[PDB]
């Protein structure tokens, strides 16, 4: 078992950043394959041994990550991505913080050569494929915690940005199908978990708190002056007094930018806050340079000298109160004892300035001249109030400066990382946060691929997944996605001369285009199955009404939707819309397309689509369908003015007979019927037929007597 | 797990009638929860189609043979797998016919060693081991190849002779 540790240390020595030039790349790809095989043979039980677990966790992920961003060849990158994916699949339970950084850097390189991006996508693809619940599982395991990134949503956002045909310049032609496979697999996963559960039964508080926190962080970074009382508004703080607000800043400094705190503390009105900000920290038993280092880790230095003056004043004044006074044993023979020095406020104030100068000139590259060790000790001759500092004071600080510089790129970011570590119905409920933050993007990309592409096979899969998305939006009560889907499909159907089995401009445009066929079928396939009318909005009602009216414009839709009403009231069928010329010009390819359209509408069950099922029968449909009436003769629409009015009227009578609100809604439709009945000299049969409907409305309504009087008179 | 086969499928797909078979194989093995009832001749048949034919360059054949060796070494096919006997029959059967510079033949020889020496090699039909012995003897007797491959041939034939005559007990 020690042999295993020695062998894995040797494999670490094979592949690493430091041991780059010694061994060739054939050795490195071979070592990657070896580590892959070692993980594969036993990875479930590899976690138990901590001496080995540190070796496979901490220092080998360095070798993994360092040669994704920096490498340029393809062969090594293949094996490294193989090892990475196997590590994700096998050891996904633990090893959670380190993996997030490499996914973040993966998407960073992906979003911003050609073949390398294809290899990246093609290799990382298997995570969603072999684990269809990967997007959910990463959300449970990683997203729900308050801290860390939010790369679960960014995964789908990155796939969405990569999915379009617009990425020809960014990536080669193989990427879009590969990412679109997982993009469609996401929606296809949900129908597996829908069959069991009904709508009414359904009808992550930590995530709610995280959303509140992230919005507060965004506002606080945008404007701390308003953000502070806004932070009090959310109840995350004890009170307005500066003690609690100052306590908030130190604990959660990892997420906040340094510049925000720097500009917040710079203003003169908030200088009193510095009386209590530094009071929390206490550097007793530590030298001034270490305390200055911890201070510089917490915020960024300003640029203006006058602004810097008050900050240095507060910093220097804060140290004095921490330490008491025992200075009577001044001497130069001391060997690392601090308490003998107990300077005044001015002494620490002057001591602060000379310490910071070494970083921005000697270590800075722009300035070439160097002020030596001589002139630094030469500066303060008789500057600390008539008595000089001891000459062993500055040498220790200069030695402490010379070892390491302060940092306000890649290696240093790991330093904060390890310090964090070292020191069925329920799934649906935990769902509904995924779709809210990605749904518009997913439907936009699906529609973009559907409208740009031309192959039938891709488009059928697209429209089916589109219907899956529509069902998903229907199960919850989003009512912003669903209207977008149905409205854009309504635009996409392509229904917004001498005819004869008619032939028409809209008909021939329908038949010649395959795109409209699937849209018209699947659209009323959505309308067939529904469980509430309120999700529809006014615009979609206008769209479907315009669809049915445009179909009535030609002899496509047979207006015999309700034979029961006509058989009750004993009228013939409504008069057909009277086309031009009839015999059995067009020839060859004109008719053969259009007849197919005459087939396809019959496949939609258009009569029983929106009117058949009772779910869509509501006040909105009647109220807008009466608005749809033209009420105006024109030479352009003289073909069908006499018939559209009768069709609309009878269709509304049948619709109103179903609704049980038999008190209010009848008044509006009776009003519009009598307003419609007085058109300019409409023909005899129309006025003949309209009075039967008018008597029926008078029967339906209650206490509508004036209209009956006018009807008689 | 049994996710290794899909990974090798995407690895071999980068070759730029067989690519269609491999993509069908990937779409089929999207399925989870082990290989299960899969009729295990078909889980790896397109790999045998690569090595069996004689119209593909050596690089793809080497990749396919590496995939086969990976499957056997990790023991993807086991006693629990349906029709494992037929699959391990077919994999030795295909290698005897035409193939393919010399490293490909050594890979075939090493895989033959590993298959025959293991327990599953006992399940091969007695009409097949003669073909394997004929192939290895043709490699060993011929001198046009490199000498080190001939020595590898010598060692494998000694090993499989010991394994065969041990069964005579």
Residue numbers in the entry:
A (entry chain A): 329 to 440, 455 to 545, 554 to 758, 768 to 782, 799 to 871, 889 to 892, 903 to 986, 1007 to 1135
B (entry chain B): 11 to 26, 71 to 154, 162 to 230
Authors' description from the paper:
The budding yeast homologs of GBF1, named Gea1 and Gea2, localize to early and medial Golgi compartments where Arf1 activation orchestrates the formation of COPI vesicles destined for the ER and earlier Golgi compartments. Here we present cryoelectron microscopy (cryoEM) structures of full-length Gea2, the yeast paralog of the human Arf-GEF GBF1, that reveal the organization of these regulatory domains and explain how Gea2 binds to the Golgi membrane surface. Gea2 and its paralogs possess an N-terminal DCB-HUS regulatory domain and C-terminal HDS1, HDS2, and HDS3 regulatory domains. The HDS1, −2, and −3 domains form an extended helical repeat structure that is contiguous with the DCB-HUS domain, such that the HDS3 domains of each monomer lie at the distal ends of the homodimer.
Three-dimensional classification of the particles revealed three distinct conformations of Gea2 homodimers that differed only in the positioning of the GEF domain, with each monomer adopting either a “closed” or “open” position relative to the regulatory domains. Based on the relative numbers of particle images that sorted into each of these three classes (~30% “closed/closed,” ~30% “open/open,” and ~40% “closed/open”), the conformation adopted by each monomer within the dimer appears to be largely independent of that of its binding partner. Strikingly, a closed conformation of the GEF domain was not observed in the Gea2-Arf1 complex cryoEM data; instead the position of the Arf1-bound GEF domain was similar to that of the open conformation observed in the absence of Arf1. In the closed conformation the entire GEF-HDS1 linker is ordered, whereas nearly 20 residues (residue numbers 781–798) at the C-terminal end of the GEF-HDS1 linker are disordered in the open and Arf1-bound structures. For example, for a portion of the GEF-HDS1 linker in the open conformation, the cryoEM map density of some side chains is not well resolved. In contrast, the closed conformation, in which the GEF domain active site is oriented orthogonal to the membrane surface, appears much more suitable for productive encounters with the Arf1-GDP substrate via diffusion than does the open conformation. The structural data therefore suggest that the Arf1 nucleotide exchange reaction involves conformational change of its GEF from the closed state to the “open” state.
